[PDB]
CSV table of C-alpha atoms and ligand atoms in Angstrom, one decimal:
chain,number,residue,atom,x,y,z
A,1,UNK,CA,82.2,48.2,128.4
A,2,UNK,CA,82.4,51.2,125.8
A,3,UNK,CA,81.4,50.5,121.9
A,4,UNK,CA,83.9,51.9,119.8
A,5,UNK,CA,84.3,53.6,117.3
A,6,UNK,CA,82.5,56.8,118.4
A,7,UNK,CA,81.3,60.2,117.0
A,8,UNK,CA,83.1,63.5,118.7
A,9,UNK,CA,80.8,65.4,120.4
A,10,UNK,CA,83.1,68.9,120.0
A,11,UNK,CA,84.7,68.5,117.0
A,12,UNK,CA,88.1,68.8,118.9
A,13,UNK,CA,87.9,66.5,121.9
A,14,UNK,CA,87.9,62.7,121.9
A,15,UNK,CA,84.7,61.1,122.4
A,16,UNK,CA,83.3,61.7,126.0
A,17,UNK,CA,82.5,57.8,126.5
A,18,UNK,CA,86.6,57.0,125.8
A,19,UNK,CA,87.3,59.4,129.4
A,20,UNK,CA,87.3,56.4,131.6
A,21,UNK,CA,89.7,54.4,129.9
A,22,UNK,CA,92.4,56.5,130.0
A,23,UNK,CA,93.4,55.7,133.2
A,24,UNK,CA,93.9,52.7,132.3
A,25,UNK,CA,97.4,52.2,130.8
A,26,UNK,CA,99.0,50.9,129.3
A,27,UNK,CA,96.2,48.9,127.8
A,28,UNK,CA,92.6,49.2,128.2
A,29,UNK,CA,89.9,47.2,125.9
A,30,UNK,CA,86.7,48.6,123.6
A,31,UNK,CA,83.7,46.3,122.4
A,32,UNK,CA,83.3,46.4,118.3
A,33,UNK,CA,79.9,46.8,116.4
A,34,UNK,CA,79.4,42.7,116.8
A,35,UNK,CA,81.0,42.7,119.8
A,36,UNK,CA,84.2,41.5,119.7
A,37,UNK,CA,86.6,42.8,122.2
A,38,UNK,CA,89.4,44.4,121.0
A,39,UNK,CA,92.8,46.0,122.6
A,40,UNK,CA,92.8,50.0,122.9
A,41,UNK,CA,96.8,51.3,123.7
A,42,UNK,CA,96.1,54.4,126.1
A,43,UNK,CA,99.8,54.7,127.1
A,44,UNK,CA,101.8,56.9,124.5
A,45,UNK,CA,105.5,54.5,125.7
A,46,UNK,CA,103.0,51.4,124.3
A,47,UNK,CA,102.1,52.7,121.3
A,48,UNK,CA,105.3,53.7,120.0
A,49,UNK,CA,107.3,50.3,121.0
A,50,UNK,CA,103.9,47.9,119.2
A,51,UNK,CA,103.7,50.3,116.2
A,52,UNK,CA,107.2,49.5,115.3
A,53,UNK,CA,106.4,45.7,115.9
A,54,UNK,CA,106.5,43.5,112.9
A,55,UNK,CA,104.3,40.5,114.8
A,56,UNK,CA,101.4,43.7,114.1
A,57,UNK,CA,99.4,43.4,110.8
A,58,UNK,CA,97.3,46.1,108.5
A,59,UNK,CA,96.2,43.0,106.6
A,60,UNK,CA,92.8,43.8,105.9
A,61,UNK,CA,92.3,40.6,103.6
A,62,UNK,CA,92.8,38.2,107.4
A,63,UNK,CA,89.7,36.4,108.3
A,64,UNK,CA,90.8,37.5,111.9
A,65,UNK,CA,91.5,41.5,111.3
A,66,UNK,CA,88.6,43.4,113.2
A,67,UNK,CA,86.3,44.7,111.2
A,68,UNK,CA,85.3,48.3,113.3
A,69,UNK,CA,81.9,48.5,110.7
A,70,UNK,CA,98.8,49.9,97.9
A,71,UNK,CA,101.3,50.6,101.4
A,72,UNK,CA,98.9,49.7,104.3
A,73,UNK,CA,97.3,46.1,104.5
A,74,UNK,CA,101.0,45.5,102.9
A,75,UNK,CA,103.0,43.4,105.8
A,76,UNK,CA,107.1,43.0,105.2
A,77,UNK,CA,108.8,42.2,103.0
A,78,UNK,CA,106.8,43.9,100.2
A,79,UNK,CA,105.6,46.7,101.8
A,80,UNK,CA,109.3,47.5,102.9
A,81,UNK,CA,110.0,47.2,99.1
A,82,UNK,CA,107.6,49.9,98.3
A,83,UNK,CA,108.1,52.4,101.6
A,84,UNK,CA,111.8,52.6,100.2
A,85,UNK,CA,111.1,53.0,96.5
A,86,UNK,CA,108.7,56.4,97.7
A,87,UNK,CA,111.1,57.8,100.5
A,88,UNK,CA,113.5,59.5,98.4
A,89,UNK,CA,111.0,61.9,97.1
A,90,UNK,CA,109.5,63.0,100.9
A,91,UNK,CA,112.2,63.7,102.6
A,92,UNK,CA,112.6,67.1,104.5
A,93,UNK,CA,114.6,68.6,101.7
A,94,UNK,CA,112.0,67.8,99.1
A,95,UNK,CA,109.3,69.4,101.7
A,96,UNK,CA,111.7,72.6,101.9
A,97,UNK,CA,112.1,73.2,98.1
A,98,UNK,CA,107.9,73.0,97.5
A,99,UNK,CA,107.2,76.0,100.1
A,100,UNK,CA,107.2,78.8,97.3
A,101,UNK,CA,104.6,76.0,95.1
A,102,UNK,CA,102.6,75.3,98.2
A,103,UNK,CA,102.9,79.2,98.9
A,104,UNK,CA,101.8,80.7,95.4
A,105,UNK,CA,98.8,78.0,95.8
A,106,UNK,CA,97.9,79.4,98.8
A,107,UNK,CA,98.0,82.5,97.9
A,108,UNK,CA,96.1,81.6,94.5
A,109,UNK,CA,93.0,80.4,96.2
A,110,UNK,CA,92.8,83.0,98.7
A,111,UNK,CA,92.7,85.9,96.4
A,112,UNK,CA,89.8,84.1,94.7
A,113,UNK,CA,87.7,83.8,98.0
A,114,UNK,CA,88.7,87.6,99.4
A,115,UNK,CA,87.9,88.7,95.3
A,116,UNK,CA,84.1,86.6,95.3
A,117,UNK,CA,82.3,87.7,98.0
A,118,UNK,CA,83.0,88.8,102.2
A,119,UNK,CA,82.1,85.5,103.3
A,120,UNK,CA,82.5,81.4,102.0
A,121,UNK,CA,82.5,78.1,103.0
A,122,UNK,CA,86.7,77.6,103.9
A,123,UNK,CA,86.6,73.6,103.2
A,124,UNK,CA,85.3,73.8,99.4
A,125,UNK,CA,87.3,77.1,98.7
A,126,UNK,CA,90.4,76.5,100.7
A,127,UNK,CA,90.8,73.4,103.1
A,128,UNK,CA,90.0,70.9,100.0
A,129,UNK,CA,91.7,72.7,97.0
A,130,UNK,CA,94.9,73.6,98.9
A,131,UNK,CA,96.1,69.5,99.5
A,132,UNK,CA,95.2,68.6,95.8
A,133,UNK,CA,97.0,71.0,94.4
A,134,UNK,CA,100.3,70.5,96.6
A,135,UNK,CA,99.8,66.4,95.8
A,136,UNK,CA,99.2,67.8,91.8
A,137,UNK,CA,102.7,69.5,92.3
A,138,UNK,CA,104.3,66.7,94.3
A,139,UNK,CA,103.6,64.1,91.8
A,140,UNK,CA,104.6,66.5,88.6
A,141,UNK,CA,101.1,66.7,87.0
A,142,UNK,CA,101.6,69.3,84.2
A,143,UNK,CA,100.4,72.3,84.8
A,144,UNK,CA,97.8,72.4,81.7
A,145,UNK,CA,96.3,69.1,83.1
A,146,UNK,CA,96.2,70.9,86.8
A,147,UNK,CA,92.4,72.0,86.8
A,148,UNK,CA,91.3,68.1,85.5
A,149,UNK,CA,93.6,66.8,88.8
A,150,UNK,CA,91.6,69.3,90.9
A,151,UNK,CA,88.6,68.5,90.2
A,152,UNK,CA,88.6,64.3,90.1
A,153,UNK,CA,90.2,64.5,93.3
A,154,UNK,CA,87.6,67.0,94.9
A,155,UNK,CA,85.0,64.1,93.0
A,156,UNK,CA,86.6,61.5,94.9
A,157,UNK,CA,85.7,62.9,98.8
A,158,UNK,CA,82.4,64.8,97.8
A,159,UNK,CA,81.1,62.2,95.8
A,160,UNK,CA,78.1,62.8,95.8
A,161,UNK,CA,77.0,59.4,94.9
A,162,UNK,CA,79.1,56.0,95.1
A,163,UNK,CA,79.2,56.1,91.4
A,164,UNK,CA,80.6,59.8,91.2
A,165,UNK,CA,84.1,58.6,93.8
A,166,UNK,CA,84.3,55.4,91.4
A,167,UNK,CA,84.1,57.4,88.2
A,168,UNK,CA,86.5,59.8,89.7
A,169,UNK,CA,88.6,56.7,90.6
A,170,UNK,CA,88.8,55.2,87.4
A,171,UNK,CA,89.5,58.6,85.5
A,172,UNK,CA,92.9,59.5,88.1
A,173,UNK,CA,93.9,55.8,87.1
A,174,UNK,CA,93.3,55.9,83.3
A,175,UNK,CA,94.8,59.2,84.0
A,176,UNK,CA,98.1,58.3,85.4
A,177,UNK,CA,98.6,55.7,82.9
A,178,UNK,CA,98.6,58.2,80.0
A,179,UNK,CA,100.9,60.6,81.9
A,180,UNK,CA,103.4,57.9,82.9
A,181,UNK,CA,104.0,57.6,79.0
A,182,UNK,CA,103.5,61.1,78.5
A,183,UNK,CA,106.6,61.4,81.2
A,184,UNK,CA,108.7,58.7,79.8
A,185,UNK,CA,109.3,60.7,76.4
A,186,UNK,CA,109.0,64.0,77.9
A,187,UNK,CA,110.3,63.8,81.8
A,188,UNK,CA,109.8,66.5,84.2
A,189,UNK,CA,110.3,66.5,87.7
A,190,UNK,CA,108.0,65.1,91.0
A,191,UNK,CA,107.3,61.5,92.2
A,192,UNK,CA,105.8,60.0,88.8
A,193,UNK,CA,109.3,61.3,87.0
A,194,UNK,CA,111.4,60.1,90.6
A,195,UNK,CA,109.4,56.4,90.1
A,196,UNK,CA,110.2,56.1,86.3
A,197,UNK,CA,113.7,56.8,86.6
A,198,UNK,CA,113.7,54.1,89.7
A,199,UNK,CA,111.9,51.6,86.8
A,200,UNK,CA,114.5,52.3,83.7
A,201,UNK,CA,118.0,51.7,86.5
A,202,UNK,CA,115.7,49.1,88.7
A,203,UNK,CA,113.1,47.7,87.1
A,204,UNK,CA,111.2,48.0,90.2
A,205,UNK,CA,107.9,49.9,89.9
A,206,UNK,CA,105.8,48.7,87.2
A,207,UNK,CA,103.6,50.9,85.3
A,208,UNK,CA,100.2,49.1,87.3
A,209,UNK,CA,102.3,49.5,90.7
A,210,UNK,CA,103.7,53.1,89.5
A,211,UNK,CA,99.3,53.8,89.0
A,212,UNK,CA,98.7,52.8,92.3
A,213,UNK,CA,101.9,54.7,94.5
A,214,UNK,CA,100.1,57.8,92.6
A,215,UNK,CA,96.4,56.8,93.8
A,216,UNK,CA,97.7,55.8,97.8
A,217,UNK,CA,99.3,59.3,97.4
A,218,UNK,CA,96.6,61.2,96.4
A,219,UNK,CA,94.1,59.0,99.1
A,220,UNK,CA,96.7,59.4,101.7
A,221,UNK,CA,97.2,62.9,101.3
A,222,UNK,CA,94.2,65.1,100.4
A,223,UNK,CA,91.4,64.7,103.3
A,224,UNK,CA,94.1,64.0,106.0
A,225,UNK,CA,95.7,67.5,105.1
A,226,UNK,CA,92.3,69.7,104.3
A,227,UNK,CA,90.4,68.2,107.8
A,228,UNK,CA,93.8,69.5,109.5
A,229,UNK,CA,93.3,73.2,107.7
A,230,UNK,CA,89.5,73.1,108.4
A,231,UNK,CA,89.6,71.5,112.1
A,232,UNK,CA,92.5,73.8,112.9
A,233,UNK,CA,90.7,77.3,111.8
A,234,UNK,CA,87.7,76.5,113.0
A,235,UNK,CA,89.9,75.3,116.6
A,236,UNK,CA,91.9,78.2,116.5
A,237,UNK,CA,88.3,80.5,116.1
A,238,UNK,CA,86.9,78.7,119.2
A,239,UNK,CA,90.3,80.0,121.5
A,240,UNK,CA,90.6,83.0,120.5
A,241,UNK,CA,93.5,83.9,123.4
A,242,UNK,CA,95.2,81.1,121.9
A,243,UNK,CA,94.4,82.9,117.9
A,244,UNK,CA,95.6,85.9,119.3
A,245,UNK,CA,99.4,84.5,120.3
A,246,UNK,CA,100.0,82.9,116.3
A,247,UNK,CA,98.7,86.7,115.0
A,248,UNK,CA,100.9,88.4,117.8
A,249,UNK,CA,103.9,86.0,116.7
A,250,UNK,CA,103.5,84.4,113.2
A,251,UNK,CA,107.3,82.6,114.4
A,252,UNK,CA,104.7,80.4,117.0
A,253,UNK,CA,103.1,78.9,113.9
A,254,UNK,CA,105.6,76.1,113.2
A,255,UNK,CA,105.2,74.6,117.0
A,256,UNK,CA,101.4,75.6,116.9
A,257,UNK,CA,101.0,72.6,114.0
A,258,UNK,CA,102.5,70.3,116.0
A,259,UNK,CA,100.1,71.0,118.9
A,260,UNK,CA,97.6,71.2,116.9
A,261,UNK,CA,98.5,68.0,115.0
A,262,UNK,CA,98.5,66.5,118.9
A,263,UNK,CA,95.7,68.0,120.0
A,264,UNK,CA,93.5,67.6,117.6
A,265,UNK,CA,94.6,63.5,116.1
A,266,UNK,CA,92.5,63.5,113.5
A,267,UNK,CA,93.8,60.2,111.8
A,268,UNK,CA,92.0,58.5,115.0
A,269,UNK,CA,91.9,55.0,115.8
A,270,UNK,CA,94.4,52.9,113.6
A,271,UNK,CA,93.7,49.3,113.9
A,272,UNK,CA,96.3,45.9,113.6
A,273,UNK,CA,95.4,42.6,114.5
A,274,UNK,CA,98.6,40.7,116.1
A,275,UNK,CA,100.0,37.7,114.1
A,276,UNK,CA,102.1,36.1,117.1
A,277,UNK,CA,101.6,36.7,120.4
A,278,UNK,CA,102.7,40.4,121.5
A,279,UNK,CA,103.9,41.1,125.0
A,280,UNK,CA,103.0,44.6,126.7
A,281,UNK,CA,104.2,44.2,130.5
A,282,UNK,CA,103.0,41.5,132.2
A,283,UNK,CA,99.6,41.1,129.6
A,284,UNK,CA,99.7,39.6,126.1
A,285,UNK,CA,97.9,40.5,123.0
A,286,UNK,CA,97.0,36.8,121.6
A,287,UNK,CA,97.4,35.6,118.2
A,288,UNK,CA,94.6,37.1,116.4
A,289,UNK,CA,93.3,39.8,119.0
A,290,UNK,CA,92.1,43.2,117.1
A,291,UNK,CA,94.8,46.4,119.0
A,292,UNK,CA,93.3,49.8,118.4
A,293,UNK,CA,95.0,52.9,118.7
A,294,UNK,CA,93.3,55.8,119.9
A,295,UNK,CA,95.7,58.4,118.7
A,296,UNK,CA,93.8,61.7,120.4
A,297,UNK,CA,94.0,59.6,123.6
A,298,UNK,CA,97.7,58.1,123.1
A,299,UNK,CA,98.3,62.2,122.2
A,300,UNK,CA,96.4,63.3,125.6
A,301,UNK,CA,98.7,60.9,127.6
A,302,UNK,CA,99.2,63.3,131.0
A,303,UNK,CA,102.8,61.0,131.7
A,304,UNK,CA,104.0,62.6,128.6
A,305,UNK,CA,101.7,65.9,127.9
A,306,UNK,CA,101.0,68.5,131.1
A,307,UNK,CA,97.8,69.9,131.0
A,308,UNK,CA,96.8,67.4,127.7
A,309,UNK,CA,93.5,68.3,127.1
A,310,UNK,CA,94.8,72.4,126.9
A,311,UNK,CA,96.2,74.1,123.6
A,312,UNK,CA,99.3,75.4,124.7
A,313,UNK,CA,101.9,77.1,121.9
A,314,UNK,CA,104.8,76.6,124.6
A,315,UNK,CA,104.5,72.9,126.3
A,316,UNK,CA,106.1,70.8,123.5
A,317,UNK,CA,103.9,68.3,121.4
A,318,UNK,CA,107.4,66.8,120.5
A,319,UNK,CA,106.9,62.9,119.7
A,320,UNK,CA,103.1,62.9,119.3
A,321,UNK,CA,101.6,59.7,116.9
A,322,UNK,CA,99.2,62.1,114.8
A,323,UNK,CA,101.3,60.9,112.0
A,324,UNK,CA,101.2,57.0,113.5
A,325,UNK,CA,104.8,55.7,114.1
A,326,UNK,CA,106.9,53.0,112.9
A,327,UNK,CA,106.6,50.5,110.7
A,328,UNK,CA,103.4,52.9,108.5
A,329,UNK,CA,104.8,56.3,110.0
A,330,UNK,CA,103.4,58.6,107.6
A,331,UNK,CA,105.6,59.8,104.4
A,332,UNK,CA,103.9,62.6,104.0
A,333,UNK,CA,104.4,64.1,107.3
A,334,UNK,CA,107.4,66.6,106.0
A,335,UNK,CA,104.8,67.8,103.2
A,336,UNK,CA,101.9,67.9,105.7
A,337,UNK,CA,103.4,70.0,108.3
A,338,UNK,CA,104.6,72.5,105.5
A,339,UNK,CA,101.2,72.7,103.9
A,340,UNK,CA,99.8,73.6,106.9
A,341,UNK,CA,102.6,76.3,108.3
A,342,UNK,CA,101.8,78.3,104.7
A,343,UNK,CA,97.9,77.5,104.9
A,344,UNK,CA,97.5,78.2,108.6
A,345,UNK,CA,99.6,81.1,108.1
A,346,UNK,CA,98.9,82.6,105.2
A,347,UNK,CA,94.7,82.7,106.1
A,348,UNK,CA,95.9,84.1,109.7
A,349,UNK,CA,97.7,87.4,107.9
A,350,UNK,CA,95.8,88.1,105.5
A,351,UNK,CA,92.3,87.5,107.3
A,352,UNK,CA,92.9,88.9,110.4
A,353,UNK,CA,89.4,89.3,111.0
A,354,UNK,CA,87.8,85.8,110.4
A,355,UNK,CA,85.5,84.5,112.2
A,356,UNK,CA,82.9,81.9,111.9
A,357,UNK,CA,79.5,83.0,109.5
A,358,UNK,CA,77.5,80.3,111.9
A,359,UNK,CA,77.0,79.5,115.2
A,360,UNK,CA,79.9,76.9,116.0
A,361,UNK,CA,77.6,74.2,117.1
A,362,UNK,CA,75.3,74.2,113.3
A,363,UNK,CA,78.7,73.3,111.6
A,364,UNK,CA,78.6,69.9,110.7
A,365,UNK,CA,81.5,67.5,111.3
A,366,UNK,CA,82.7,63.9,110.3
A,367,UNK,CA,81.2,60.8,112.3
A,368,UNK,CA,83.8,59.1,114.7
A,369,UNK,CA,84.1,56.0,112.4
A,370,UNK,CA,86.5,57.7,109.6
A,371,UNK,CA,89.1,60.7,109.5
A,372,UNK,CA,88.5,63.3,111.8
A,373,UNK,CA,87.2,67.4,111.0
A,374,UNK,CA,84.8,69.5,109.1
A,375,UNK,CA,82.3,69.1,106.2
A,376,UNK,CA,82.2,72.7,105.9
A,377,UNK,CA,83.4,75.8,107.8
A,378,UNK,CA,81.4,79.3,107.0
A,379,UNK,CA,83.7,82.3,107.5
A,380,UNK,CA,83.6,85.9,106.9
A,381,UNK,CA,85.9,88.6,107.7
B,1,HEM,C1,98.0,66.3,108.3
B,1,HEM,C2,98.1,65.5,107.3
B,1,HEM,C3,98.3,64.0,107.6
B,1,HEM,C4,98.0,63.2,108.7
B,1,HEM,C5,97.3,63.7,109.9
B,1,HEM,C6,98.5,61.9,108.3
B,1,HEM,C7,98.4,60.8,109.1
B,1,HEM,C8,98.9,59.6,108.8
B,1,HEM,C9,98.8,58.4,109.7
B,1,HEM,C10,98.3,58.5,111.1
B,1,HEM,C11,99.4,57.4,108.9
B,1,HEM,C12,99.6,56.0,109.5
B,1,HEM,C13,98.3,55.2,109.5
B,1,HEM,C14,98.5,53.8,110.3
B,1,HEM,O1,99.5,53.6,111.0
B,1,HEM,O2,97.5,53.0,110.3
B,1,HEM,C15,99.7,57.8,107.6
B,1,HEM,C16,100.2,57.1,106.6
B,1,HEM,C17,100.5,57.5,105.4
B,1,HEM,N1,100.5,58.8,104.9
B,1,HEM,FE1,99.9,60.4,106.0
B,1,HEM,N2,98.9,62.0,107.1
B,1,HEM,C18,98.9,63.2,106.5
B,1,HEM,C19,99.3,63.7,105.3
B,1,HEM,C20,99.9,62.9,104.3
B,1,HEM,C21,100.3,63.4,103.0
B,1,HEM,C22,100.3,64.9,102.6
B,1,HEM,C23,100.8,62.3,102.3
B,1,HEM,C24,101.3,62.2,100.9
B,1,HEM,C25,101.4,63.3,100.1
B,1,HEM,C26,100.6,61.1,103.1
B,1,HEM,C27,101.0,59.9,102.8
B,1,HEM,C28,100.9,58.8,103.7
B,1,HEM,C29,101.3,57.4,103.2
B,1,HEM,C30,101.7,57.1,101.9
B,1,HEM,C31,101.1,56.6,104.3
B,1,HEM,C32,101.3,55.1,104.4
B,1,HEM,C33,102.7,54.8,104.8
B,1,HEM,C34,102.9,53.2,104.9
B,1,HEM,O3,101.9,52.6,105.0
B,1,HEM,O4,104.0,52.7,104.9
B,1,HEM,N3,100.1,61.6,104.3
B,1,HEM,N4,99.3,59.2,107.5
């Protein structure tokens, strides 16, 4: 019987007590905190056919979801509604035509850590800033308004206090609403601009629903994308033969995000609880049973991944669920994987001699029971 969820004990392995399950596909089982038994998919075939199954729920507000301690919660129809009112502006092309924003930001916040000091703390000056300011651009914030966006959004993760993330909350919010009227008399370009249009020919996003796409965004996108940057340096510093390939070959860094995205699954443990009966073989997920997925496991799968548990630039990570799959695949993922080429990247040329300013095992780390990586990552160079 193994509790779930739980804490890494190296920051880019799957929790030792989850080992024993794997074997066991394409379904195993975990015990919650009250000890309800709930499905865990360990077989990567599995996992992609239930997370496009619409008999799965994210409905949070169920008296039956599992409880391990807008978008998601949404079920279809209505969440179909909003997924295709956002689409349009994440598409591949839209990722393509940010990479010389995403680059000068990048390149912004570097020179400011190379110009204060030899040394700093890579997730306050790099790993957090760089996703904010990318989401800031994506969404058409204007550029005057850039450094208030910034800083409300680093509020809302660092907190410190519960009343510092709601504060932070409620000014992005009263925020948007001012800048959605600000737009409609003066539009520029990015999602808020893409949504009004879609509300003067549809209707369809209110200015309250408009408020809240913007808020999911920003949620969605920041800590995902800066625990990726942080977990991946500090990764990368831990092997280095595997460093010294991406500094060798900067053309490996595009299929090094992907296996890094696989290897490390940061966005761990997505939970559903089944509406209807769902087959899987010859077992059945019941009616209101709880299914987690374990996406480092589901990503370590050896049927689809040789070697899984090895960082290897050349044995393809194609069709890993770091981004989930399906009916909540993420929108972002075209934007995220972009982001992290030009961090990633960028740090590795123009730091060539990073390395970490701590021994690697006094860096502190995120508990299992939320989104995987680092609190903070000293480096020098
Ligand atoms: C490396 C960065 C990221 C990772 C690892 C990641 C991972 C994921 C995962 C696993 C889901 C599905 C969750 C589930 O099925 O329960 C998801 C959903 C989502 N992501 Fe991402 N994400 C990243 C970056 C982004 C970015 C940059 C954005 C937006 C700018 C974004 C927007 C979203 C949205 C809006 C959803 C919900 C889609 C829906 O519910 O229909 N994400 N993300």
């Amino acid at each position: 019987a193994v509790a779930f969820p739980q804490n890494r004990s190296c920051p880019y392995h799957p929790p030792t007590a989850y080992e024993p399950l794997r074997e066991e596909r394409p379904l195993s089982r975990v015990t919650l905190w009250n000890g309800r038994q709930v499905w865990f998919v360990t077989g990567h075939q599995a996992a992609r056919a239930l997370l496009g199954d619409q008999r799965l729920s994210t409905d949070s507000t169920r008296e039956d979801f599992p409880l391990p301690t807008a978008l998601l919660g949404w079920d279809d129809p209505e969440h179909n509604e909003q997924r295709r009112m956002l689409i349009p502006s994440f598409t591949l092309r839209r990722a393509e035509s940010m990479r010389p924003r995403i680059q000068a930001i990048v390149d912004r916040l570097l020179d400011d850590m190379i110009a204060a000091g030899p040394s700093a703390e890579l997730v306050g000056a790099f790993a957090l800033p760089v996703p904010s300011m990318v989401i800031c651009e994506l969404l058409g914030v204007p550029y005057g308004d850039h450094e208030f966006f910034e800083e409300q959004s680093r509020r809302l993760l660092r907190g410190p206090a519960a009343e510092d993330i709601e504060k932070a909350f409620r000014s992005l919010e009263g925020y948007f609403g001012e800048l959605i009227e600000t737009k409609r008399t003066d539009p520029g370009e990015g999602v808020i601009d893409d949504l009004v249009a879609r509300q003067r020919e549809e209707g369809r996003p209110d200015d309250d629903e408009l408020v809240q796409f913007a808020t999911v965004l920003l949620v969605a996108g920041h800590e995902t994308t800066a625990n990726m940057i942080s977990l991946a340096t500090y990764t990368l510093l831990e092997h280095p033969a595997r460093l010294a390939e991406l500094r060798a070959d900067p053309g490996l860094v595009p299929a090094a995000v992907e296996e890094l995205l696989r290897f490390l699954s940061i966005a761990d443990g997505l939970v559903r609880v089944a509406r209807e009966d769902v087959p899987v073989g010859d077992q059945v997920i019941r009616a209101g049973e709880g299914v987690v997925f374990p996406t480092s496991l589901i990503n370590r799968d050896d049927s689809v991944y040789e070697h899984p548990d090895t960082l290897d630039w050349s044995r393809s990570a194609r069709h890993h669920v770091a981004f989930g799959f399906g009916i909540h695949q993420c929108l972002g993922q075209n934007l995220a994987r972009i982001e992290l080429e030009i961090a990633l990247g960028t740090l590795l040329r123009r730091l060539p001699g990073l390395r970490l300013a701590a021994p690697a095992d006094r860096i502190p780390f995120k508990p299992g029971d939320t989104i995987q990586g680092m609190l903070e990552l000293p480096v020098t160079w």
